Amino acid sequence: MKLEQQIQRVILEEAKALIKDYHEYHNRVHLESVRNKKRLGDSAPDKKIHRPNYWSFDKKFDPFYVKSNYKSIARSIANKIENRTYLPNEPFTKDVPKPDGGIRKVSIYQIPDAAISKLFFNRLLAKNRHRFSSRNVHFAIQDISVDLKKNERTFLAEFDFSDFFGSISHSFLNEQFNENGFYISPEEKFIIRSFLRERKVGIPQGTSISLFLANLTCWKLDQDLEREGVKFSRYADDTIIWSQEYSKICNAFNIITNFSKSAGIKINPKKSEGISLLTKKGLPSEITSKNNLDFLGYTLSVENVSIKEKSVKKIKKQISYILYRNLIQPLKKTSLAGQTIPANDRDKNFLIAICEIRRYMYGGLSKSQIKDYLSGRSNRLYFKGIMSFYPLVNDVEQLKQLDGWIVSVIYRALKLRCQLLSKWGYNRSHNFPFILDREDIVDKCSKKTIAGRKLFEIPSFLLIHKALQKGLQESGIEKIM
Amino acid sequence: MKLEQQIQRVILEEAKALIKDYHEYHNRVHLESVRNKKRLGDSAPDKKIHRPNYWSFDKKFDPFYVKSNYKSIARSIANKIENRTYLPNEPFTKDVPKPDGGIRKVSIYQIPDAAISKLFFNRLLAKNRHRFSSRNVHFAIQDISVDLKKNERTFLAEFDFSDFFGSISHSFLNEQFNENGFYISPEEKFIIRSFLRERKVGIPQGTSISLFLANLTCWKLDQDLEREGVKFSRYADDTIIWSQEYSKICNAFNIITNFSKSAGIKINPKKSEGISLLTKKGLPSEITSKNNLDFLGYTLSVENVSIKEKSVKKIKKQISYILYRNLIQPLKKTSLAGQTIPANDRDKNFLIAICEIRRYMYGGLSKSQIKDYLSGRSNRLYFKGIMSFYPLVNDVEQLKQLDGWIVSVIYRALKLRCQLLSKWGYNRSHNFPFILDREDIVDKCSKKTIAGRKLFEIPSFLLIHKALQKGLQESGIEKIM
Amino acid sequence: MKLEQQIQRVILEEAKALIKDYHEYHNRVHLESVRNKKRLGDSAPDKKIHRPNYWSFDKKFDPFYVKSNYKSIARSIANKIENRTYLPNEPFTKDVPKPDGGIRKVSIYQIPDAAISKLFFNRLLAKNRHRFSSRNVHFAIQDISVDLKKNERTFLAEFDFSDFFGSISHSFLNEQFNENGFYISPEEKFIIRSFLRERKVGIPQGTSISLFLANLTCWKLDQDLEREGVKFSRYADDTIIWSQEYSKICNAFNIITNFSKSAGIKINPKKSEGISLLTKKGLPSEITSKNNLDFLGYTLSVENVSIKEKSVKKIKKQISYILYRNLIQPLKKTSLAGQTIPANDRDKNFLIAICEIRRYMYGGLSKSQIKDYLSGRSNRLYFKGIMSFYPLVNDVEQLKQLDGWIVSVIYRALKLRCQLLSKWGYNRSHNFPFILDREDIVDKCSKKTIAGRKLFEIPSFLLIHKALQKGLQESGIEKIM
RNA sequence: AUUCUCUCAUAGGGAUAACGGUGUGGCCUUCUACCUGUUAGAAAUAAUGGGUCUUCAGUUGUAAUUCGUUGCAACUGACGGGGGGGUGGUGUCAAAGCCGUUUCAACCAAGUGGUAACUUACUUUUACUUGGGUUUAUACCGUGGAA
RNA sequence: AUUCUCUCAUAGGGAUAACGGUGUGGCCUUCUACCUGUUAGAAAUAAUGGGUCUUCAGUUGUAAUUCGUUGCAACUGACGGGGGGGUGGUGUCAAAGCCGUUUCAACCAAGUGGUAACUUACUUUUACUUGGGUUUAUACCGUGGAA
RNA sequence: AUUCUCUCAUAGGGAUAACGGUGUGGCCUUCUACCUGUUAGAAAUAAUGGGUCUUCAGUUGUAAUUCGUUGCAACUGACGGGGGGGUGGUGUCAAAGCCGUUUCAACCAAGUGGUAACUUACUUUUACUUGGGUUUAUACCGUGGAA
């Protein structure tokens, strides 16, 4: 098919996607505002709707305008490409200064350039997919865990690349292009050179074409490491190498060092940890040793795999915020006007908080459905929650500790709510749910039923963990994900 | 010969041995009581004779009854064995709870079962003795010491098995039985299965048959280690491996780890020390290092072999107790009735104490006999003392320190005795041996002679050490032991 | 040619050299005394001339007497050599007790014996020069630096021989003589045996013949190390071995240890440092690591080569002493009689101090000559100063720090001089050079000119460093040295 | 006599008084961008007396290629430590930190329990002094001779 | 106009006013153990309203084998953190320790020099919401038109 | 009865009263340098009673070789811990340190929060007692018999 048809199709698809998103955004904002008005009574702020700032700078950024004229641009681009005069327009870049990632500048490109880059990247990847080394990182996690279990003592080397994209040398890339027997047409080379453009060093960040170049640069390193006989995995901006012999790990370190010099890239000293030995807890080591290793939010050890501390902190933060927002925040305003005061042993806010916590943790599944699936009465279940992102966890003690934390936090929050209500002049200590001790919370809430459905049940990590383990055993990681 | 004759002979020998022992016990107790009556005067306690408690539980335990009827049991056992209905009776087990060894349960079996086990074990060992890897541990000590001296830097790995006997898997043993081309008759297999009996896991402790099974289980490990090329020695519940290359020691560690998993045995983390480098004192090491290694009460280092600290503590305890018992303990009783008070420059208790110390250290040999043997006037000497258990010691400084300790302790004990005697109302400061200073003790005691024999000489470790070294050089360790 | 002619020539050359030296000594002492008389006025001490004490003990030590009768000695020596009755006379030995080097005894020999030893050593070295392994240590420094830069991680082992000369075993040397296929005539062997003479162990120190023996003893060690594949360098009483594999370094350590036992030499434990890993700063190591290594006054690291701390301390000491001697010391005497007081904005002592510092640092070269050579107006320069001894330094920061130190010390010394002059009763604060602040010292001194030559310029290390680097790049180390 | 001769030659006899070196000057020749005074005298040139510049990395411009980085501008960026006290900004919710002004120290000392001295000196490489050559101009240094 | 047409086509002309989505309900069909009320009406069955169970490891018993661990009972063992104060046992020669009762804290906090706030929020993977399909029932959200 | 016999034989019948060990002495023989008392009686020898020596490393001397270190002198160097207090030298600019005299402690204790007891004892190898042989000299130890 002609170039124009393909360009038109890609531009149309991109515009339709962006429009769709925007529409969902404003509709959700309306629903949330409606709920907030009831929650905060007459102190609720008014609704505000915003449009992205960068849309104003150029008409091309705005999706609707591009949708209006999606034919002229395609023809002009095709003609400019045939004439070999095409050049991508300047991107919009905004820095994100932070302690981690430094400047962490991010760039966004106009819709036509992004569409062209995506099309070319897809074609190149399709033709050259076979000549490449082995969301699929989970299989690597399984392999490393199995190897770690097989022998207690393993040698590990961890390298953290710093400013990998920024320092790539164009001459090195030019050398790679001629060698390795890859298939690249003249037009593709022209487009790649056009994208590099003025930049003296480095490759553009935030573009689809860049990923292919990154894979291309590391082909020789992968071949050399495979020839050596060590095992390795590379994901994002990190690499891990493990072996059972000191000599091989030393040779791998030498190869990595020599490669960095050739390609003008530097390894951050602070982030890099160096060679170490991973051994079971309670056994001495003759060299520097560690008992746990982190990979993509997973903590791996000889005995078991557990969730990383930071993820646990985020989960605790979210649950705490939900409880605070629904129970304590509304009562600290100057005037309690428009709000509903709990009475006759009924509290709506407690129900709303419990439902939101259930949605965050499971996705809305009831305990009965999980039990039925486990027993075998039903054949299917859907996983749509925070737990889905960690399908391979096998540690039981941590989940129990988390469940205890949830129950205690709920009890303390309810007590503080009761104190504030008493301070405002209403005494509701006798009425439920303020009359229940910590030990009795689970059973009393479990028994209570509203409208024939048990909506007061406290969620438990262990039950979902059991369901996940059974699903994994009887199926595959790809099926679950 | 028929089975009955062999069974009869073994049972008779066991009964005669036990009887003999008992008779020696009671006779010795009588002699000791007679001496105690003189030592403690009229405060001496009366003699008490006891019989082992477990004898009462069953008639078979008692030796005399079994001696009375040693024919019927043999015939019945032979018939039951031929019918394949034989089963060993339950053993008597008494726990020994302690910090070291934990429960440390010990079991004793009746005389017929023990005789049967000994007979079968002897036959099996005789037939299968050749297919086994190399009181003979002393030769191993010589070899390791020579290797340690040859090169200053050596790599060592030490593993302490925990509950080795308890956790042996029967399935693994069954697998070993079929393989390895050993010669085992049907009756032997039947007896081994009978001994295992109800036990789900583990092998009986305290029986002769168990040792053969233990050697059988470790055959593959020994073959693999020999194939690797490292050198090792296994005695009791400990193993040592040494080599001059890091790679081999790492491979040996891997082999040991893999074997433990296969045979369901665990290595105690606390007792195990891990890989280390043994180097001469005053030289730095790049990894964890040690300057001394302990083996069966021996401390081995690059420079020399010396006695372990615990053994020295036991020797000090025994010598101190003997001096206290003969010099201080009799004078702290309420009434000094029936005792003899030192007078006219003569003290019997000092003579008795010195003679007991000499018997404990040498075995009763005089200094003259040792000197004659060293010079060559005589051709033979007998070694029967505490020193005999440590025939390879070559450290001279430690022996000198011990001799100084002995002289000082003797002087202090005599001074305390003099003070107590003065407190009771007798002043004997002028009379010997209370008039001698520490420096003059050895010479004055040496010169004094009673009945034409020098009985007041103070024993010296160095002289016996010289005699032992000369005997070892002119003979062999087997001859000395 | 006959033996007599050669002996005569060597003796004559030695005597003429020694005489020459003596004459230069006394003439220099006269000039220095003349300058001192002006510097210290009427407090100057009187001149004293001395002759070496050992000259008195024997007439042979004195050069003039040997020069008077250089013919008889040659004939007598030749006849005694032919008769095989020659024996060297006893040397004069004086101990130099110190913490470093211990007794450090040094021996001096009479002129004829030294001449004979030099002649024989030269002939033996000439014939056997080819059979030897690779002021030439600088090339080794270049090679080690290049290797260190090539790979960041390197393994190093350093051994310090102790009393190497003292403990050499004669039997070992005798064994070496027969083997290795060296060419040694009977007379040479006779002379070597004569030199060893009464000494039971060791070889004489301070004689030319000894060096050849030292090279001869280590031939086997060098061959073995080369066969192993490691790289090494031996200079004076130290050796360094470096490699990129742990196994090879361990084998080299074993070879060195085995050799020492065979040749009865010991390695000092304190001086020896053991195996270590040299890595770039800021990168972790799994074993003992260091970031800098010292060799013959040079400090070598991955980034650059810099001067050792001790040499810097000596340079600081010399510059400080020169400033103190010319500026402060003359004014602390009891009476300022015969001295010249600074007046009319002129100070001779400052000029003398600056000229002496320039002579010590450069050798007298002006800034203009260096600038002309750098630009290319002139083609040649001569290097004759302290800097010449360190021709390979490439560190710039250290030189800048040294220059700042020099300027500050000059300013402080001038201030103290002004205070002392005021204390004596003369106020010269307004007059130069006491009116200049630290910042303005360099420019004001630079501009000032006397007799058409700029003699007040402050020397700078960086300019000479640049000249040295340019000379090295455009020539060779041998040419510069 | 350190100069020259004789034999028994690792030591002994003789005969002559000079024999070895250092500083300064001279001469020979040896690698050197300019701009200006006053002399001389033809600008052939000299003679003297004053002053400025030289490096590295760019940014480009250029050109040139000689197929690369060359030669040029012109641009702009470098190019003389550290320590102890006082007092100002600005840094935060406190703070670190970063800037600037004024004082104290001959050096080791960015430290010792405490801090002064020393170059014919101290000790582990630690060591050398200014293109050469030749100067019976000139003044002096060992040891002799004379006395 | 985000709808539709025209050319010089990354920009320009026109013509019509509608054009994209969200919640709830409906319908279609799609994987589900029982025991009981009241309805209806024949127990063919419906209609609604209430309540219980589901996992893992054993111990065995059993049987069965299908040559092994199967299917069953029945048994008994699991299955919702941590921190600071008070007061009881029991632990020793002192003691650790182990047990139990009562109080304090919205979370990071098992900590900071000190401890409050926040979701259209914060940032390193940090990201998603409830079998589908179709509903001019019904109520609303951008941007237009009318005004 | 632990001694001896019988059968149903991991248990049952009988008949006799002795049956196993320890200390001391005796005898048999077994590897031992001298010098002296008193006995006896011929120095063949005995009998008893008193006292000394034995090792390693040298230095050499020697000799010898047996081609090396041998055998000898003779020389000189070794050969019985540690801790807490007081008081002397000498060590420095202070000091460490090295020497010497006097006191305290039954051992672990060169240490514990604190320090006493114990051998038919305690526990991780921890375990053995004095060339053998034979002694119806002599005195005693289990269990029996008699009573």
Author numbering:
A (entry chain B), B (entry chain C), C (entry chain A): 1 to 134, 143 to 489
From the study:
DRT9 systems encode a reverse transcriptase (RT) gene and an upstream ncRNA, occasionally in association with a SLATT domain-containing protein. Here we show that DRT9 systems are triggered by phage infection to produce long, uninterrupted chains of polydeoxyadenylate (poly-dA). Poly-dA synthesis is primed by tyrosine residues within the RT itself, and is templated by a structured ncRNA containing a universally conserved poly-uridine tract. Our study reveals a mechanism of antiviral immunity mediated by DRT9 defense systems, in which a ncRNA templates the synthesis of long, kilobase-length homopolymers of deoxyadenylate to drive abortive infection.
